[model samples]
Structure formats: C-alpha cells, structure tokens
Target: SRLELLPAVDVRDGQAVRLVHGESGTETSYGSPLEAALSWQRAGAEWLHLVDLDAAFGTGDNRELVRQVTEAMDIKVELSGGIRDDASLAAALATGCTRVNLGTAALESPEWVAKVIAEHGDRIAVGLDVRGTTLKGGGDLYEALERLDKEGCARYVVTDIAKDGTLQGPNLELLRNVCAATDRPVVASGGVSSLDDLRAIAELVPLGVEGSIVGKALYAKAFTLEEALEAVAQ
Candidate 1:
C-alpha cells in the first residue's frame, strides 16, 4: 500500500503554529490556520492533522477557530488536543472530523479508551506521544504498547516529542517496537526531514506503518508535498 501524507495544521490563538517536543504552551505561529489547511488541501494532501495548542496547554484559546477550520475543510481531518473524556470526545466528534486522536485520555483511562474502541472502532485513534521510551501524559513516558493492547485501537499515531520539528529523524526502533506489538496500522509522526525519511517509512508499510504526518520539513522548504507523494509512491 502507498503511504499517506497527513499535513499538520496546528492552531494557537487562531493562527497556525508548530510546537517543539509537544510542549503544551510553546508555539511559533506561521499564519492563518485556515489558509494553511486550505493550502495543503489544494496541494493534494489526503489528510490534515489539526491540533489546538491552547487546549493542549490548558490556556483556552482557538477552539472555535479550530472548529471552523475543521468544518470548512473539504478533505479528511483528524483532530487532537484536550479531548480527554467523553464530553470532550463528543465535542470533538461533533466537529465533523473523520477521527479524533486522544492522547491524554488514552494514557489516563485505558478502560474507557478500550470501551470507546469497542464502540467506535476506527473512528477513535490513540496518540502515543513519547520521548524515548517514556510516555508524556499523566506525567510519565514509561508505559509500553504491550500494556495498551492493540486489539481495539483503530490505529496508533506514534510520535516522538524529542524530534518534532527538529528535522532529526524518527525513532525507528520505537516504531518497530510498537508495530511488533500490534496488528493495527500505525501512523508515524514527528521528525521526517526528507524524501529519504518517507522512503524509509514506506519500506515499513508492510510492517503496519501506514502513513506519516509531515509538518516542519514541508514548511521549512526541505521538500514539497508533490515530491513527497512521488517519493513515497516509489
């Protein structure tokens, strides 16, 4: 299968921004969030990964603006941040996103997450954000995939906070470890600096890494979406 590219549109105070290491309050705005999203859509991106930085930071900004972007987009949207419980989940689902990636909820309430998985199936994705082997929600990163169980998870978006926006490289060992634990498809996010990274990820396609989320490299001019698509297609 061809690897899918999910361009990121991270919103903070209604502007598009990219954070380093998944830090809640840290962000540097690019421009209009909606404009950024539309640009990617026009460039042939199949999926958009939207994040609300304020919500992630507990600062309470841009929720409405982010919702508007989500509602306005023509392509598939996957939303993350602050979707920590059933109420927030309901709110996120109401925004017309194809799926919701629950990070904090997945770490805090495994039983609820499992129940949701059984209920919604693929509509619910777990964001397994990490720094090295340590998980970063509920204040620790030590949790392993074996503990999470892949049976009910729709898909796992495995991200390495340390390499995010750094143009370093993805944690392939961690990715391989996660894939070894689950039959469910994994969408790799973070790092991803060049066509070579996409090629490497594509090689792992048969191993359950179905897609990647590329942000900084695209914005920083390391490559274009068209080039990335072609490279992954190879």
Candidate 2:
C-alpha cells in the first residue's frame, strides 16, 4: 500500500557488487548477480533493481547474466545502466522486464527521449542521478524532469550519488524538490540504511515518490527484507 522495496543487484562484470562513492576501484563484490537476485526474491522482495555496471561504465555488456537474472525473477524488475541508444533500449525491452531506466541518454538526447517516451510511455523510466545541484553529467535536474513531464514521462528514479553508499540517509530535500517539479512517480535510490529510512521515504508517497532502492544496508544485514516489508506496510 506504500513504498515498494527494490532490492538492488549491481552486476559489474557478472558479479553483484556495491561500489563505494560510485568509484570504479571501490567495488565490494558479492559474487553472482543471480545469487543476489534470487536471495532477494526468497526474502520476499516485490521488485528487483537490476543494474548492469558494465553497460553503465562502458566496460562491457553483461547481457547474458542480466537475462538470466530477469528470467529468474518472479517479481517486477527495473533494469538500469548504459541504456543510451536504440540498440541498448531495444535489448533492455526485450528482457521481459517491467521497465528500463534511462540514465545518460535521458540527459543527452532530448529528441530521442521524447520519441521513446511517446512510444514506450510507462515502460520507460528516467534515471536522474545527481551529485549536488547539477546532474551527474550536466544540466539542472529539476528542469530536465519537468521537460520529461511535458514529453509524457510517467516515472523516474532519483539517486543522490553523494548520499549513496554512505548510508547517511536518503536525501529528503532532493527527493522532495524533484517530486515537486514533475508529477512523475519517483523511485528513490541510494543511502538507505534501515527500516526507519524506508518509513521516512514512504511518507513521501503522497508526493509521488513510489519506491526506494536498497543496497549496502541489505548486504550488511542492517535489516532483513521481511522486516523491511513489515515496516513499510505499517
């Protein structure tokens, strides 16, 4: 009834890893991406936030591993990372996943994004990953989202890259500001550390923040997935 929990599996070179500070060399590997996905499913997760780090970083493509994970999931899956063009988008949609998130592409290619938004609608989600005031790449984040809203974007995933992996807590102000700018439902990502953090984010559901992606905390056993579900339900 409230916020959905998307347990994240950041597949870097076929392994489930959580990167510190989004740094390339700071990866802490948890082994197979499918192992992480299956574990989250068994723990009663309703959504899987599957990320292909290889695709995101232009390191390589983890297509086979990503496919296996998506096929292995019974719940809805939101696939992200390195979906910047026609080929990438096509491949992502073909996975039978619920949605494919756009990162660098959404920021760089306005015309293409508009076409994609019109054609795909809710199946497409924009990833507005930010560092501070500006977007990770460039441009104002709120302005970009508002533009997408005009183009009929339905949902978005907002990540505060700074708060990410710090467990400093979700950036409340950033989420609030972004939600205010566009009517699109947002999936809050990064820095989520505990059940209370979920509770806090759930409070913004009225503001159109639909979900949150949890990483390090889950890996660290800060709270079990069962505990998380109960907390949000309450």
Candidate 3:
C-alpha cells in the first residue's frame, strides 16, 4: 500500500488515552501505552504514531515511559507533545524514535522551527491542527503552509482538530486542500472510523497524502491492523 497507516498511542499520565476533539478531560483510557504500542507493532503495523498528551497539555510528562515504549518497538515511531523549546526537543529526539512531530512551537516560534528544520531535515515534521478554516493556534493556515513548504519541512501531519477522536471519518476535503497547498508529504490525522475510511485515505496517495494517522478507530476495534493493512495493500 502506498499510503502508510500510522497507529496512534496518545499517552497521558502514563496511560494510553484517546480524547474527544483533542480535549484534556474527555479521555478514554486504554491501559498501558507500552502494551498498546507493542500490540499494534505485533499486528503488522510498520509505524507507530506515539504522542505524549500530558506534555502537550502542560499537565506533566512521560519522558521515560515514551522512551521505554519506543525502545521496545522494532517499528518506526513518530513522537509528539509539548516539544516547544530546545531542551524538550532534544529530549524527545533522544528517545530514539525515527522522528519527532513539532506542534505548538511551529506556530509560536517560526525562526526556531526553521533552525531545527535546517539542522535535522526530515527528522523534524510539523503538525498543523485545524478547526474549520482557522488553525488551532490562531494563524493563517495557508500562510503557515506556504512558509513551512519553503522552509524545507519534509512532511506535515495535518489533523482536523474538531474531528480528532470523533470516529466520524477522515476529513478528505481538508486533506486534499493541504495536499494542494504544498508538495511535501502529508499525514492525514483524526476521525478515521472504519476500513472503508482507510481505503478512502489510501486513494489520496497520488495527491501526496503519504499516510493517515489512525487513532480512535483502531482502538475502538473498527478493524484489526492486519485487516487495515490488507485492505489497503490492493
């Protein structure tokens, strides 16, 4: 399959949790993050989208837990959450994951982002979370997209903030818009509900949607990871 399926493990307070609309308290606990990550890897996932929800929310951090989980897995991992400054970014990269997705800092610190991008290349990817036409952090979405593209950002993990954890379906239009905005590879995130939805995302591979980040759907047992891999293999 051309479209990579990145199973997500959003860790909060040392427990794997998925929130509704990326909110803080609307969590549905899924027990140990390590077990959850390993379960997906064991089920034939090539990549794991591991996020530290605690770090992102300023609640606390699970640095050791995230590191342990990444160290235990053989598959590639993309880690995110609260990675805003030099120390935090350094710590996340030191976890030995393939790459770290930068969120708030990308919006709040453009020069810093460009510096990291220049220093690390593909090791740094930007996350753009949008709610309707507005970006989550109050920036012009397309403008930021243009800036990132020119700054040599290797990829964009575009999440529909409203649809995150909703189990509705991936926002195809939003993805298409982002794909059209830049040549950089885009990873579609949030709102994937079923195998059919997976296929729909796979359909956009030619347009530069390199992958889809499936979180709540897979945890909800919409389909097995093997099933998803098989369905998109065609």
Candidate 4:
C-alpha cells in the first residue's frame, strides 16, 4: 500500500506556525491557519493534520478557530490538542473531523481510551507523541511507550517530537517498534524531509504503517507535495 501525505497546519494564536521539535515555546508564525490549510487543500492535499498550539500549550484557546477550520475544509481533517478528557473529546468530535487524535488522554486515562476505542473503533486515533520512547501530555513529550500497550489502541499517529519541524527524517526504528506492537495502522509523523522519507515509510506499509504527516519538510520546500505523493506511490 502507498503512504499518503498529511499536510500539517498547526495553529498558534490564530496564526499558522510550525514549532521546533514540538516545543510550545518555539513557534514561528506563517500566517492565518485557515489560509495555510486552504493552501494545502488547493495544492491537492487529500488530508490535513490540524493542531491547536494554544490548546497543546495549555492556554485553553483556539478551539473556536480550530472548529471553524474543520467546518470550512473539504479535505479530511485529523484534529489534535487538549483532547485529553470527555469534554474536549466531545468538542473535537462535534466539529465533524474525520477523526480526533488524542495524546494526553491515551497516556493519562487508559480506561476511557479503551472505552472510546471499543465504541468508536477507527473513528478515534491515538496520538503517540514521543521524544525517543517517552510520550507527551498536552503536547509535551514525557512518558515511555512501553507503558501504553498497543492492543487497545485502534490507530496511532506516531510522532517523534525530537524531529518535528527539524527536517531530519521520521524515526523509522520507533515506527517499526510501534508497528510490531500493534496490528492497527500507524501514521508516521515528524522529520519527513524529502521523498526518500516517504519511500522509506511506503516500504513499511505492508507491515501495517498506513501513512505519514509532513510538516516543516513541505513548508520548508524540501520537496513539492506532488513529489512526495509520487515517491510514496513507488
């Protein structure tokens, strides 16, 4: 199976920005998030990985604006940030996003995550945001993945916080370990700098890695979206 490009549009203070290594304190604004999202959609992107930086930063903001982008877009949107509890989960699902990727909830509340996975199945995706092996809460990388079994997880957005927006490459070993742990599809995120990274992910597609999220690599013009789509297709 071919891996797909999930262009990212991270929102901070109403503007689109990409954080250095998923650090909330290190954000560089691009422009309006909506505009950024629309740019990807217009550029023929089929999926968008949307994140609310404020919510991720524990600021309790950007919900309305994030909701608006979700409502306005025609492309599939996978929302993240502050989806750690029932209220936040409800709000994210209510926005009509294709799926909500919850990070903190998966690590902090195992029972609720299991319950939701049982109820929603593939509609719910777990955001396993990590720094090497440790998972993050509120977008802050901390706990280790060995603590969170993959059996109960329906799908995973495996991100290496260390490589996010760094233009290095996806952490293939981390992705392989997660794939070995779960039968569910893993969507690789962070450090996808070129077409070769996409090709690398495509090789793992047969092993249950489904797709990948491309952020700074694409934003930084490391490769065109068309080039990425083509590489994965190979």
Candidate 5:
C-alpha cells in the first residue's frame, strides 16, 4: 500500500460520532463504535483510526468501550485522545493497536515522550496538531517538530486545524514542509474531502507521508470507503 487509508471511528459516549474537527459538542452519532469498526472492515479497509472522544473531551469515560472497539478490529487501529501518561499509554498499547498517538503529552511532557519513544520505538507517535503556525502545546510548529525530531520520535500524526472537518482539502504545503524537516513518517490527518484528495495525498507518499486519516468524508458518505481505497490503489 503506497498510500494507506485509515478510516475513522471517533467514539463519544459509546457512539461513533463525527465531531467537528474533534470538538466535543458538535457530535452527530453515526452509530455504535463496534458497528463503525465492522463496517470499515467489511469495506476492505486495512487500517483503522479510533479516537476516544470521551477521554479527549475530558467529559466522560469510555476508555473501556473504546478498547472494546479497538480489540474488535481484525486490522490494526491507531489509538488517540487523552493518552498522555504511563497508565494510559500502557492501557492503549495493551489493546494491541499498532501505534498509540500522544497528543497533549508531546507539548506537556517532553521527558515522558522521549522515554516512551526510546522504549517503544515504532509503536509510539506524537500528535502534531497545529493551528496555523503554532502547535497545540506552546511552541511554534517548527520548534515542536525540531524537538520531536531530536527526541527520536519515529512518527507524527499531523493535523491542520483549519482543514479538519471542513474538508477544504489537506494542508499540502504544511505537510510538505513537515516531511522536508524530518526523516520520520508523517501520518497526514484533516481535510481529505474526496477520492481525488486521497489520490493527491498518495502522490506524496514517496516524499515521506505514510498515510492519511479520513473522518468526515467517510462519515458523510463523500465516497464509499471501498471507492476511496480503490482510488489510491489505482
């Protein structure tokens, strides 16, 4: 798979909700988390992007339900949301997901992230969620990237906030700059609106983009999951 597709099943309060750009209150339930996972697999998906919005929003507890969804998958799952410490990281990795994405921790706890990166290697990834030129924590995007690069962070799940959920199309310029800055794989997230968008992203795989996460597009039926996968395969 030159350009792999990670279909999303962001769960909130036990339902698969497509929250606007990962914002809490905008959730419109798609269905149960398990069903979403199953549907994507039936559509011939090779990977899954599963988020625990309950944990993410700091409003409720669905860690177990989220784990249920992840463990139910036959394919690899990329786990995200509220995973910022050892206890959480241990729990997420126990689900057998191929990788665990650490968001707030990358900015809040640099030492812990570095330790995890050295201990887990490929299984750990940092969230490079950006709002314009700045990252979610404190530093500018470049400064954060430089720190992560030096930490020996192996992967990054890069999100351009302006593009996420809007489907305006991915931040190709941002992604290009990110890839240019490091040798690690950059997992592109946000603003994949169509099969063509997916195709365009496929073109950048050789430049170091490993894959992309498709959320609103998949939930909104912009195209069938199977069609999206086939688009890139062609």
Candidate 6:
C-alpha cells in the first residue's frame, strides 16, 4: 500500500512559516506561501496542507492570499484554521480547495460540526489536535472520536501538538489509537523529519492512515519532496 504525502504550507502574515509545536512565536519564515505551494506541486505532491495561522489564533486572516494560493494549485489542497461559522466555511469552500479541516470548531460547536458533517459529507474533516490525551479545547481524544464517528464525519486529521515541528518523528501510538477509535480514514500531521520517519508512518496505511502532513522537515530540507514521495512509493 502507498501513503499519500501532503507537503504543508502554513501561512501567517501572508508568508509561509513553520512553528515549533504550532506555537505563535516559534515561526521560521520561508518567504511567499504561493512559491512554497508551487514548489511542492512541482515536486509531484499529491496534496497540499495549507493553514492560516493568523485566522486560527484570532489575530487576523489572510483569506484573499489563501484563496489565491489555493486557486493556483493544481493538486489537492486542505485549508485549515478559523473555519467555525457559515461565512468562514463558505469562503473557504469558495476557494475551490479540495477540503477544509475544522479544529476548534469541532470542540467548541459540536452540534454545528455535526450539522456540517451531515450536510457536506466528505468535504468536511475534523482535526483532533491534542497534547497527550487531552484535546486542544479540553476534552478527551477517544471520547471525541466516538462522537465524530457517530456523526458520520468522513475523516480525521490527527495532530500531536507536542511532536509538531520537533523533527522527532510522528506519534504512531496516537495515530494507531485514532485509527482504532474510528473507522474513518486518518491523516497524520506533525513531527515527520526524515525519510525513515515517513516509512514508519507508511506502515500505518493499512490501519487507515491514508496520508501525513509534512511541514518543518520539508522547509528545513531534511529531505526533498520527490525523495519523500519515492521513499513511500509502493
């Protein structure tokens, strides 16, 4: 089996940046988000995990910029951050990105999340960003998974907050647990630093981990996207 590779282009202040542990102050600038997205596409990436940190943090938003980048991309793009209400959701969906990942909204507005899931089906994917067993908005991970599964959520993008940007490798145990908790396909995010790390995640493909989001490691040039893709080619 093959594991899909999602090269990430996390945007903040209209620039591509990678934060250690997804924290605000830890950003390492990488120039234009469009350039980054284009480079990844040029390297034959199947998917692009584009995030708006400003929107996620409630500081500001780069909607226009994000839209431009998404529209320019030929590959699948998953937009994340601050998509809590109808307006934001509409705007995100308007960009024509493949899907939008809902994080805080999933934990804050369960009913709304469930409503959108029923309405949009596979277009909606809930992000379960956790620190250990606790979710970002203060709930148990396993408990949330059970509820999402019942709500017919199409997929789950699982992120281990502590492992993000650390280049320490993914938390396979967590991905395994999430895959076990819900039958939905899982997209593992964070802590992937090397080709071997990607290979290890590939081992979880049969367990329902269809892809992984690679961020800092790619920016830091631990390995190129073509190499990463070839490493996991079946």
Q: Per-candidate TM vs. native?
A: 0.93, 0.97, 0.98, 0.90, 0.96, 0.98
Ranking by TM-score: 6, 3, 2, 5, 1, 4
**Model 4 misplaced regions, further than 4 Å:** 137-151
- Report lDDT (Cα) of residue 155, candidate 1: 84
TM-score pick, better of 1 and 3: 3
**Model 1 residue 109 lDDT?**
80
Better of 1 and 6 by lDDT: 6
| Positional deviation of residue 102's Cα in model 5 after best superposition, in angstroms | 0.3
Residue by residue across 1-234, what tens digits does model 3's lDDT show? 378989999999999999998999999999999999999999999999999998999988999999999999899999999888899999999999999999965568889999999999999999998897577867878998999989899999999988999998889999999988999999999999999998999999999999989899888999999999998896
TM-score for candidate 2, residues paired by index: 0.97
Candidate 5 regions exceeding 4 Å error are none
For all the candidates, what are their Cα RMSDs to the real structure? 2.0, 1.1, 0.9, 2.8, 1.3, 0.8
Clashes of 5: 0
Query: Distance from true position, residue 224, model 5, in Å?
Result: 0.6
Give the higher-lDDT candidate: 2 or 3.
Answer: 3
Q: For each candidate, what is the lDDT?
A: 0.82, 0.88, 0.91, 0.80, 0.86, 0.93
Question: Which model, 1 or 5, shows the larger lDDT?
Answer: 5
Candidate 6 whole-model C-alpha lDDT, 0 to 1: 0.93
Q: Specify the highest-lDDT model's number.
A: 6
- Among all windows of 10 consecutive residues in model 4, the one with the lowest summed lDDT is 139-148
What tens digits encode model 5's per-residue C-alpha lDDT throughout 1-234? 488899998887788888656666888888888988999999999999998877776776577887788888889989998887888888889888889899964458888888989999989898888888787656788887888889898998999977888878898888899889888899999999998899989999988999999999998889999899889895
TM-score, cand. 6 vs. native:
0.98
lDDT, residue 6, candidate 1: 96
**What is the alpha-carbon RMSD of candidate 4 to the true structure?**
2.8
What lDDT does model 4 reach?
0.80
Question: CA shift at 127, candidate 4, in angstroms?
Answer: 1.2
Q: Write the per-residue lDDT of candidate 1 for residues 30-85, one digit (tens) a residue.
A: 88988899889888889999987777677785667877989988999999987777
RMSD of 6: 0.8
